[PDB]
Amino acid sequence: SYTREDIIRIAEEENVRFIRLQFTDLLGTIKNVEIPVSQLEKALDNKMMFDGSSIEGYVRIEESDMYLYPDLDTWVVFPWDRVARLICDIYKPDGSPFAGDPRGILKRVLKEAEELGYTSMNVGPEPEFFLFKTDEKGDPTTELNDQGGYFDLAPMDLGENCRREIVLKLEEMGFEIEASHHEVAPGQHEIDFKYADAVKAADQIQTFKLVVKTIARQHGLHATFMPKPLFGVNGSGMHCNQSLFKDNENVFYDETDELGLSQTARHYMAGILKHARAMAAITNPTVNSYKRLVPGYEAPCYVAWSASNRSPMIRIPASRGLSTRVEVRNPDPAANPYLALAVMLRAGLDGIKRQMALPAPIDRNIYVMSEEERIEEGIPSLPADLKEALSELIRSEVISDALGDHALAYFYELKEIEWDMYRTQVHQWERDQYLTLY
Amino acid sequence: SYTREDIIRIAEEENVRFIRLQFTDLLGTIKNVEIPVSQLEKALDNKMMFDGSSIEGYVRIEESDMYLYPDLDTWVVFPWSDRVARLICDIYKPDGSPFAGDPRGILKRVLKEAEELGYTSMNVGPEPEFFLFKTDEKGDPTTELNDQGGYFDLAPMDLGENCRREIVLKLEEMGFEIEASHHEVAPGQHEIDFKYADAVKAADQIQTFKLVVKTIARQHGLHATFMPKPLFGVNGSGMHCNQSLFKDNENVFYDETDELGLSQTARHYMAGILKHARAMAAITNPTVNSYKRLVPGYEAPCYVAWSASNRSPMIRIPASRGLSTRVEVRNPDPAANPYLALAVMLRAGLDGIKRQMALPAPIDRNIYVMSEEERIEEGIPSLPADLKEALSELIRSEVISDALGDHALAYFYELKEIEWDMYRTQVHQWERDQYLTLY
Amino acid sequence: SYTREDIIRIAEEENVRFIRLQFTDLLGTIKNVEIPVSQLEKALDNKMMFDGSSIEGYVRIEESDMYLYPDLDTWVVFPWDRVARLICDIYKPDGSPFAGDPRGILKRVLKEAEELGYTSMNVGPEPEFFLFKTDEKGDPTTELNDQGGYFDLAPMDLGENCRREIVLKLEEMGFEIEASHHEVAPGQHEIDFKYADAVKAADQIQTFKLVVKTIARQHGLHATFMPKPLFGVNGSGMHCNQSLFKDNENVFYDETDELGLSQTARHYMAGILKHARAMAAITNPTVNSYKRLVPGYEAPCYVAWSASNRSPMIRIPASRGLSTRVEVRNPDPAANPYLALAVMLRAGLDGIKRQMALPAPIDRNIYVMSEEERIEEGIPSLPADLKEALSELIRSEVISDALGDHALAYFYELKEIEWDMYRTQVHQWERDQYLTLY
Ligand SMILES: Nc1ncnc2c1ncn2[C@@H]1O[C@H](COP(=O)(O)OP(=O)(O)O)[C@@H](O)[C@H]1O
Ligand SMILES: Nc1ncnc2c1ncn2[C@@H]1O[C@H](COP(=O)(O)OP(=O)(O)O)[C@@H](O)[C@H]1O
Ligand SMILES: Nc1ncnc2c1ncn2[C@@H]1O[C@H](COP(=O)(O)OP(=O)(O)O)[C@@H](O)[C@H]1O
Ligand SMILES: C[S@](=O)(CC[C@H](N)C(=O)O)=NP(=O)(O)O
Ligand SMILES: C[S@](=O)(CC[C@H](N)C(=O)O)=NP(=O)(O)O
Ligand SMILES: C[S@](=O)(CC[C@H](N)C(=O)O)=NP(=O)(O)O
Ligand SMILES: [Mg+2]
Ligand SMILES: [Mg+2]
Ligand SMILES: [Mg+2]
């Protein structure tokens, strides 16, 4: 790991002139202040301050002073006067860590895993995105960047150059990129990168979204991670591939098993399934998230698992060994990555600690099953809208405890205001259906 | 009470050349075929047919032949060239039995349950509010309301005076007893009140009222709508259903010894309305948009409660006594099928009487500003928050399900489940505005 | 006076098909419901009801039922199926008169005058108005109907036909019209009518405004009684000419006096002056009212009186006998006529009852006096804005008592919301002055 002295040294060597101190609000939005390198020693002394009452989910105006403590291992130089980055943890002025810090929330849950002997939670996220064209002014239009489809080539796929420049920038920043391709829906794109320990994976999701939007704009496009920008075509998921490790060993892997899944893996999966409905408000946190969780678009809407199957909530991909993993498919890229990893880890650990029995897999296209069949086989549904998910979240002591009292209370208040504003709108669909009929 | 010979005579007297045979589909939409007067004897002979598979909620393509039996007492000439009259018809199957899914037959069935308990009439006074929108050169509505006036305003703040006045003149030529007309609370919103009538006639008059309003509004270059909530942030349109039971000429809801003038029968009736309020919401508030009106702060109900002279609760008792003593059920909106709405409210009320239900305490506050904590304290239930929740309550209610009958219930549920599922998968512009640049 | 039986009879004789039951909200806005003549007997039985929670200043949603009791002497037929009118008083369902009814408030103050022996308060109001052109859609533009001036003729004055049709309609409705002319500002107009007892004068102001706006629209124009629609030109006043009578005798008249003013007249004037600042919130009730009360436009802004002088708050016109009167010039036509007459009568009566000493007149152009001179002669200012006027209103027990507790509390709450909304706006003037300067 880097020391204080290492950062000073490297900042001079690479001639860094500016440093961004970055952190994440409750809703997952990245935030930063930029300081000249003359201030780097002040920043490393943990003395930078900000207004916590202007950051969503943090504190109130009457006790608004908060501090940034940089995590020196997050040091990296931006490719696009040299600018560098430090991701920071949030502290109160009395020196204690801030309970509502999403990154601290993940670290707290990860300590629970370490005490059970798991040295790391490895996470490979797949944050899909759409690219929209922009007008003369630079705002997004309703027109997608192309009308291509899954694995298409140019000129059907017009995202090749934009995705490739994203990849080159991510690689200069230390990402191990695995693949790049057009996704199923028009104007939809995917760039995959190697799994990493959970905190780093969530840091990389934040950085990934930032690089994607920055490069998209240089190409005259607008990138969005909105879960379902368009009816009738695929939405964008952020599948969270997960495994637990003991130093070097993927403990989810058992070569004697049919699917390569250890008993620990199956208990973990059972925990994800058990608490699926209760974590949905965190993994699928917008009104629009539930427009993606509709049947027929390779997004889940029922609580089930199956191997090599893209209809259920959990897929077990058809590979084994170090790549043995649980693919939880319901999160979308609007989820706060720190909170989403935290609640899924706590749900998985509860499954392990209580040795929860794994339900039988649903080895079929779950979308074409009737409600009758779903009831016969005891297949629950994911929540149908944000309000229902929120009601399940507050009733869950396991998921509530993951979040802690502060984030839970702020998250619920924000989302109840969001839902009440949505629910009272009169949408154009209603005018089209009813204005001339009634 | 008109005979066939009366209708023949009157059509000649008035020089009627065409007759509309009118009826109502399951969702409340009026339907008709127009016949020349040369065909009137065939129509009075109950021989007119139609395709029941093309009328929402009736029958399937493989069993699609259906008959119209005119109700002779619904005869009226339209006042607005070659004279046109109408008859409202009941729906019959080719074997001669009345169609189980006919909304007008459904209300008549429930009314017979009232008659056997001694009540000779259910008197109903509906207040169907509506908006007037301007139209473009092609005649379709724009987003602009006809005016920006408000409650009881005068011209030129209220620009609907002439349109409302001509509606009133046409309705009175058609035998309506008009009581009042005024601008309502929201911009471009209007109200025309007419005297209560027995339930079937009241529902027939609701169907006729909506037709005349839309026809005259179009003559004035406007588009009338009974959509419950066309615009966020201003009042929606309700159809308050004022209700009383009579024994020949006596209003059995009236008791002068009572502080509000309500008899014990009225109080039991109200208790049945409140008991079944959530279960009949899908009928009285049958669209997705209905539930954007059932939000607090706009004189539409949100919570299941009653109060005197209070416009915040579900039931208001107006500060009138005597023949005008009544129960104002405020939650229906003018998208409700009037025959089905009256049928389920009547059934709920009668169930409250047969079971001698205890009437909850009144909520004598602005219920909108009560905290959720206070509302649980008093045990005030909520109306369903959306159409899907309303449908779930409907199919679980034996009392409301049996008001509708097996046929209408099954078709209503199938239609509305499809409607809900279509709405719930849409991505609305609000979502793009909130999320496309934030995420 | 008319009886119930008289109204039924006349309604049949003149073939009236519809009746408007009219009344006035707290802010002076006329309101009505239209009933078919079949309902006339119900209306005369005092059984018509309305939602008092939708009428500004009346009652709350939880006790919203209110009743209309028509005043049979207000019967009149509209000129423009015959429609008639009845002005109504407001009652609660328990049968008591509604304390917040502006017309009942005036009648209550008038009872105070009758007990002192004055049989009527005669009031001649001069409600000036502007006419604006309208667009293709019918909304007002910024363009006035003409660019004429005081007493101008066509084609400089383009309001002649519109004013003349207003006059003809008012005369068919029983008005005694006295004069019609273009006023000082472009597009500004005046129609005068004979004084009447106070309640009738206020009824006639309501009817006058309605006829003016109706006929203006038939001519493709928009009439407004806004006090000051345009900077730098005259605003619109509603001068309230006032006198007290004993049966037939103008008690303000004394032929032995220099100005023809009785001692009663001078005490009344002293009361108006004493409470000028305290009644301003009622006589000048909008934010815009105080844009008219600026110097140089024949509107008052200082508390003073003078004969044949159009600079002060009170003018004594140069005529005597039955036309001896006190012209209170500060009210504008946005004032509720019932409340405005009520507070000025109560102020005048307080002057009589306390035999208040009349200050010396200010026989000069008061606009060109320096602040120093104004202080030397003890000339107070009218309030500078609505907020200051409201603060003076609540501190006045004489004017507060005129209004009664209900109207006072609703009026203050409405106007404090109005003022707080105005005071936080950022106006274009501020952008023009400061956006490029700072
Ligand atoms: N043991 C593991 N634990 C967690 N993630 C893993 C593991 N092995 C591989 N992954 C990651 O899972 C993700 C798979 O993404 P992708 O190749 O898009 O899969 P698919 O499209 O089949 O879902 C990659 O980020 C990959 O690095
Ligand atoms: N006994 C009664 N039963 C049913 N309806 C009645 C009865 N008495 C009056 N009504 C009706 O109730 C309705 C009241 O409507 P409206 O006058 O708009 O009342 P509000 O606006 O006060 O709710 C009218 O249709 C009236 O005829
Ligand atoms: N004794 C009186 N009391 C009240 N008003 C009066 C009396 N005599 C005349 N008036 C009225 O005063 C008003 C004078 O208006 P106007 O002729 O426009 O006067 P000016 O333009 O000079 O102010 C008229 O309504 C007139 O009828
Ligand atoms: C072909 S897809 O299966 C698309 C998934 C969809 N966009 C969703 O999760 O909403 N995803 P993957 O990258 O896992 O193969
Ligand atoms: C003033 S209002 O109270 C408006 C009610 C509202 N439009 C609704 O029921 O949605 N109705 P009413 O005619 O009963 O007085
Ligand atoms: C010439 S004017 O003096 C105009 C008065 C001005 N409009 C005002 O009172 O604001 N009025 P009047 O009709 O009294 O002669
Ligand atoms: Mg993938
Ligand atoms: Mg994918
Ligand atoms: Mg995947």
Ligand SMILES: [Mg+2]
């Ligand atoms: Mg009404």
Ligand SMILES: [Mg+2]
């Ligand atoms: Mg109404």
Ligand SMILES: [Mg+2]
């Ligand atoms: Mg009503």
Ligand SMILES: [Mg+2]
């Ligand atoms: Mg004048």
Ligand SMILES: [Mg+2]
């Ligand atoms: Mg003048």
Ligand SMILES: [Mg+2]
């Ligand atoms: Mg004057």
